[PDB]
Amino acid sequence: LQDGGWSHWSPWSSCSVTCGDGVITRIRLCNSPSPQMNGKPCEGEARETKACKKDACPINGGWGPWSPWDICSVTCGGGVQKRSRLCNNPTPQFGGKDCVGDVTENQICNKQDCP
């Protein structure tokens, strides 16, 4: 009957994130020696963690909602109308990408002919 004993600690791993908060981790084994018949087990944590902090992860631009369509440029005979949006939802931050698309849309309106 031999009591367990811990190996030395493994090296610490790298930070689990390249941005934001995460942990570095290191482990050990009760192999030195392994507990024998009716031997005492190793005591304490077989692994440890720490805090690793990195700069904020990029926040990519989301589009906010479209504005209501503007009133047609004409009441009759084929006008145009316009609406628009912002890339603020969220705003690109910490190097995040720009929104992809048009800030503005146009379309025909009242295409029927006028009396």
Side-chain angles (χ1 to χ4, degrees), residues 2-115:
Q2 94 202 17
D3 300 327
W6 291 110
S7 67
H8 286 257
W9 286 106
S10 73
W12 288 93
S13 66
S14 287
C15 191
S16 62
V17 297
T18 62
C19 47
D21 301 332
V23 301
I24 59 179
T25 302
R26 80 178 181 172
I27 67 103
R28 67 183 172 171
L29 305 177
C30 184
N31 64 2
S32 311
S34 288
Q36 194 53 337
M37 292 177 72
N38 290 358
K40 294 183 181 181
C42 296
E43 257 299 345
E45 280 289 347
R47 66 183 271 292
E48 279 169 345
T49 59
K50 264 180 172 180
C52 58
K53 299 178 291 285
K54 300 278 194 234
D55 290 341
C57 299
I59 296 164
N60 300 310
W63 283 116
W66 290 110
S67 59
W69 284 106
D70 290 341
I71 44 85
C72 189
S73 59
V74 311
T75 65
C76 43
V80 296
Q81 62 184 165
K82 168 160 69 68
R83 64 181 190 164
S84 60
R85 56 181 171 182
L86 298 169
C87 167
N88 68 358
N89 205 65
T91 292
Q93 299 171 78
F94 309 121
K97 302 165 167 63
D98 193 16
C99 292
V100 55
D102 305 306
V103 147
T104 307
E105 256 171 12
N106 297 260
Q107 69 174 11
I108 71 173
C109 46
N110 298 334
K111 72 173 172 188
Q112 82 286 325
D113 65 9
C114 288

